[model samples]
Target: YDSIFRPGLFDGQTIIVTGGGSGIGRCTAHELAALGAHVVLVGRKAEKLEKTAGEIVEDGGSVSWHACDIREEEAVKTLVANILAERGTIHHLVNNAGPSPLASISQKGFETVLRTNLVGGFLVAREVFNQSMSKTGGSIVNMLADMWGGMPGMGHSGAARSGMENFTRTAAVEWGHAGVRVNAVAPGWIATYEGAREHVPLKRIGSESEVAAAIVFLLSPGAAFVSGNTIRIDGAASQ
Candidate 1:
């Protein structure tokens, strides 16, 4: 009946997608908005967020933009509060803001990567939960990486993303009583270019649409019983 999904799947929901400026985050925001959610784009770069939001709006999608670094607790708190004040309620959250620097574990800026990738996402998720989900009960999907067997070049990112997966499980358990479902998505080398190739089992990298589809499902009513799971989009490379 529908190309990707049935239309109006998220007609009355308000979804917040961090890192909504570019890459997978931007694609996810577009998909959610197309499905009728009031997609809120959160990112540190005002220009990027504005650009993305503008594109979505031009395409007849409902969206808004906010500039805030999720690493700052106060900033996240204020941002969430502002969103709630305006939108009324946050029905879903996508934690996708993070750095993906490729470096060794002994690198000097390792801690900075950790803070941006792990700490920042945790802060945003915590605020979203405390401000809205804790009372209203919503769904959350944390974006991670396919670093299951240890990432060779990006040690800091691997560690941080791994920590995020664990945090997802813990949150699912701790907040399940309140009807909050937590989950994670780990995409491996999603191809963003025309000729992009990889050494994975599929002989090619995944598309942004593939990852976005998984995310939409996790936030959809079809996955009402799914929680605390990490769905890998690596084409059986990690297997």
Candidate 2:
């Protein structure tokens, strides 16, 4: 009698959401925790992670916080190892840590944005795969942008996010035999803290919680057959 669209789909799972301190990441973490998961919130800001974790716990959800730069390979390894050692196994991973700076390929912000957005995701996924995901297999949903498809006025983030989308596909194919499924979610104009303050001028950005709904759905058991695809949560901005 239960449908895939129902909430609480992730009951009793263990998941890790990077960039869980704020914005869409924070919203997704809350959604995961609310559905009965012991979410491990990872970010560079301990205070923010702790706050988010506390809020979830206060609402009767299980959560934990860890501050780390996901770009650091060793750091990701240790984090995954610790999670596996303590939680036994991870059911899902949300690779949502990245910068969304608007600039061209030749802009000065290229290196920093690329490192944080693409490199960090690469290291995190590698460690998660090697340490725990490969054993039992898991689901991973990365974040990308819709406008980055060779569009103009969108440079650094477009390149980085597009690269991540491709990486997700390649890894999905390579790791499918190992039981791992990789995918991506590209939100068009989600109204999060950053997007509200910086990117969106029309005040029509979708709520962060709404975006998280799609992400959580992708990570749920309902999506068992969903992999190697990118789902866009944008407001049909492309169409």
Candidate 3:
């Protein structure tokens, strides 16, 4: 499918995209900027953010960047503050940053993954809501992995992503009255040859655009009444 979002859908709005340097996040940021949003690219890599920001700017879209890790509350708060101070108001948030690694469950690895995957979104989303969305009535779209009913070989990342799904479920209702929408997108393995082909039905991998479209749609006015939901992007891999 192709993007159906109208031109300038997010005109003059500020959309924050964490993990905006690579993969689906990068693609999402690109489309949002193209749609006239003053996209805020946030991550731990200044170079990567700069590179991504370059493409946006060169393409004639307004953009900004921040180098910060989400594993710390202070860092997230500062990042949010920095954005608010610069942008005046944040209209949308895309929580798309996390580390996915396979390993036997270990305290160190699991805890670290949890800090970034789950805690990071929690802190940043909470801060954004408490500081901005709580008053501005914005929207948030979280990124999740294919962890339906759970999976193995990647338990930590699975658990962390799963927690975000739960967060999507609960946060949607809690923040409903504020006119703030909360949702998520869970995709099947989409990294081309990242062992996601499965040699199975459809026999193909998902693309960054496939996921980005849904995010853009969710953040669009068309989805204003659609909240507390998740549109899985696995191409029926869950079946």
Candidate 4:
């Protein structure tokens, strides 16, 4: 389905979306670009990123790709540096990159999950914060989960994502004075590219566009009072 952007929704805004090559991240990037944002798609795979970029461009949207492995702090710094040099101002940062680590807690899978979903997310968001959000003021939307964080048995991701949820709270409180609003969007079973293959109800998997719409709302002038909260967009899967 094609998305229609409301007027002044994301005009003149620039967004950085991690893991913008596939799954939910890819969908989110396309939606943002369609809504009049200069979207920078970040991912480790250059070919995939380029493919997504081309699709966006064909749709008459502004987009670019930056190959990055967010797990490394230095790489994150460099990514932000390049972004700042190109865009001058970072209006929004969507920390939506993730690795689905479905493993037991006693195994090494927890560590792997934390590194990609937790540490990676923190370093990336921090770089954006120090680079632009703090002084110049901007918005951030953390892509989180509604499973173990709100339910249970989600293993590593549960622990890491819950930690991130709290981090968003603290950042919002501290950065609010600087005009930077930090928030988290907890998505349940999103019926994305992969979700369609599973047995989950379509309703259980919310629209990538729906989550993107919420993300844009939180980052836009319309959500000036929105901050320091964990928002669930899972179509009541957690309920």
Tens-digit per-residue lDDT, 1-239, candidate 4: 25544754687788999888887778878777877889999988999999999998998889988999999999999999999999988899889888343543655777778887788888988999899878888888888887543445665788788888888998998888988889989887765422112343444456677777677677778788889977887666565
* Count of clashes, each model: 0, 1, 0, 2
- What is the C-alpha lDDT profile of model 2 across 5-114, one tens digit per residue? 45566777889999998998988887777677889999999999989888888878889888998878888889888888889988889999973335335555787777
lDDT of 1 by residue, 3-75 (tens): 2778999997999999998988988898898889999999989999999999989988999999998888899
Residue 105 lDDT, candidate 4, scale 0-100? 62
Candidate 2 regions with alpha-carbon error over 4 angstroms:
1-8, 99-108, 192-203
TM-scores, all models, native as reference: 0.93, 0.88, 0.93, 0.88
Ranking by TM-score: 3, 1, 4, 2
Q: Evaluate model 1: give its lDDT.
A: 0.88
lDDT of 1 at 91: 97
Question: Which ranges of candidate 4 are over 4 A from the true structure?
Answer: 1-5, 99-103, 148-153, 192-204
Q: For residue 127, give model 1's deviation from the true position in Å.
A: 0.8
- State each model's CA lDDT, in order: 0.88, 0.81, 0.87, 0.80
**RMSD score of candidate 2 (Å):** 4.4
